[PDB]
Amino acid sequence: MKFSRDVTSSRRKQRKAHFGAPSSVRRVLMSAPLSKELREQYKIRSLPVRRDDQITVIRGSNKGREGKITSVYRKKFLLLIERVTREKANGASAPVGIDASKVVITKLHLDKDRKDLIVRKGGKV
């Protein structure tokens, strides 16, 4: 149960705020759990995904596949993973989008800001 007068449980408002979220807000909405080894190492449960992150797919027809994140299509709340594609009619391979909540990160694209995000989030390096 919520108690704050500043929190809305309106289905209409929550759906409007989710599908109308701006680009920077959608980054936090597209978060993935860290792997078990990574959770212990960095003391962090989950992070916003990023291009050049290493994931494995945990749900769906592509469950068990691995690869880099080639792009984060935030307009569609979708991740594009390397070598996760399907065949078009004409033989061209079309990438298949996967929700960020349906992957787990196995290796982080660590960099200065990401390192700062781990310490800020209470984690360790």
Interface residues with other proteins (CB under 8 A)? 1, 9-11
The one of other proteins, RNA, none whose footprint includes residue 107, by CB under 5 to 8 A per kind, is: none
Rounded CA gap, 4 and 8, in Å? 8
The one of RNA, other proteins, none whose footprint includes residue 28, by CB under 5 to 8 A per kind, is: RNA
Burial class (CB in 10 A: 0-12, 13-18, 19+), 31: middle
Q: How far is the CB of 15 from other proteins (least distance, A)?
A: 11
Q: How far is the CB of 84 from RNA (least distance, A)?
A: 10
Q: Which helix (H) or strand (E) holds 27?
A: helix 23-29
Q: How far is the CB of 8 from RNA (least distance, A)?
A: 3
Rounded CA gap, 32 and 18, in Å? 17
